[PDB]
């Protein structure tokens, strides 16, 4: 039911229903922050259980804020431009997610690099869904 | 004796839980001797009396030698029991609460899946031959002397080379 919940992102086109869209990418950012903070706990152990639970809460909150700001600015750009088939609508959202990343880690150069890399990653994600050849292909040759 | 193997495998889950929550390994050796006895009557209730009894003999000897090892080398000043730490005993209480919840959800919540708890006793051995003589599993274990001779040769060479392994390591 998790995959059926997460595949509600795609059949609704952009420019409509922003609340469900930002709920999907907020949950995606929270799940990726949970697995990244689990890797951070199992790579660098904290000195306290309170420090470890603050580390997983901080990383989950920052990655959920990255996903929420990415989907919110993506749907706000979709409202202000009315182009559902546009990779610039994901470029602005990826740059806002990278700016949220750099504002949470408090470094503007890291904000600019996160803007460039997350914007081109979201642009390649929307354009990969637009042409349709999969990231994980079935073996067919 | 209808729920015999189910209550034995529940005792196996309790003993493997007591091994899984990981005390000082003296208590793990005691709990794994308990679970090896449990697995001995688990195989010995099925019909093949040779297999679980010889691995009861093997696990008694090897657990006795690793028990002498863990009272020789791997010990400390204060041995952690199952009840000495409240994380271990609280995790034991949470684990038996979780297995009570697991048999609850497999008993009356949805009852959907390949795992069934209404099928007790009758789905234990599916078909055993009633009229034949060679039904004891000793000749089935002894098939490695006649038909499956290659894995027998492989395992004997493995323990020959393992004797060479231990005399290479422990010098």
């Amino acid at each position: 039911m998790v995959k059926r919940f997460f595949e509600s992102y795609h059949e609704v086109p952009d420019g409509t229903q922003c609340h469900r869209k930002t709920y999907i990418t907020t949950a995606l950012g929270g799940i990726c922050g949970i697995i990244g903070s689990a890797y951070s706990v199992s790579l660098n152990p904290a000195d306290s259980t309170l420090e470890a639970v603050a580390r997983v809460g901080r990383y989950t909150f920052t990655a959920a804020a990255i996903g929420a700001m990415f989907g919110l600015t993506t749907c706000v750009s979709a409202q202000v431009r009315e182009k559902p088939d546009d990779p610039l609508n994901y470029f602005i959202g990826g740059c806002a997610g990278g700016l949220t990343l750099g504002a949470r880690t408090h470094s503007y150069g890291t904000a600019a690099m996160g803007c460039v890399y997350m914007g081109t990653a979201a642009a390649l994600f929307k354009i990969g869904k637009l042409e349709g050849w999969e990231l994980f292909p079935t073996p067919k040759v | 004796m209808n729920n015999y193997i189910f209550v034995l495998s529940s005792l196996f889950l309790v003993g493997c839980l007591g091994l899984a929550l990981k005390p000082s390994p003296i208590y793990g050796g005691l709990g794994l001797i308990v679970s090896g006895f449990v697995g001995c009557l688990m195989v010995l209730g099925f019909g093949g009396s040779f297999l679980g009894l010889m691995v009861f003999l093997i696990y008694l000897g090897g657990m006795l030698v690793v028990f002498g090892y863990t009272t020789a080398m791997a010990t400390e000043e204060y041995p952690e029991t199952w009840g000495s730490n409240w994380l271990i005993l609280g995790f034991l209480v949470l684990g038996v609460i979780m297995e009570v919840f697991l048999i609850c959800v497999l008993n009356y919540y949805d009852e959907v899946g390949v795992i069934n708890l209404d099928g007790l006793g009758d789905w234990l051995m599916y078909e055993v031959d009633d009229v034949g003589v060679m039904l004891e599993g000793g000749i089935g274990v002894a098939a490695m002397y006649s038909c499956a001779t290659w894995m027998m040769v492989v395992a004997g060479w493995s323990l020959f080379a393992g004797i060479f392994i231990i005399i290479e390591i422990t010098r």
């Binding site: - | 990981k22 390994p25 688990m42 696990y59 791997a74 002894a142 894995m151 493995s158």
Partner: protein
């Protein structure tokens, strides 16, 4: 069926025991031996429920490589215990150099 689901729950808990370290590596060897014990119990109930006497010394060779692997690990822990004094895995912190 239900015995095999409790067997794979015991295997999942044995994997949860052997994929963490609390006090010694000896108890992790004990967890590996309980893991391969429940693996033997799985192998014997499959080869006894299917009434196949040909795949019956497959538990014998499973126990052979089980106790040979535990024998190798016990000589290993003999060498690391008479090297380090005590065989704690928290003292094994000189391989990051």
């Amino acid at each position: 069926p239900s015995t095999f689901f409790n067997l794979t729950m015991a295997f999942s808990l044995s994997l949860l025991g052997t994929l963490m370290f609390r006090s010694h590596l000896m108890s992790t060897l004990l967890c590996l031996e309980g893991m391969v014990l429940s693996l033997f119990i799985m192998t014997s109930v499959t080869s006894l429920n299917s009434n196949s006497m040909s795949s019956m010394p497959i538990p014998i060779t499973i126990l052979v490589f089980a106790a040979c692997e535990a024998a190798v690990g016990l000589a290993l822990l003999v060498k690391v215990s008479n090297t380090y004094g005590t065989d704690y895995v928290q003292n094994l912190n000189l391989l990051q150099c």
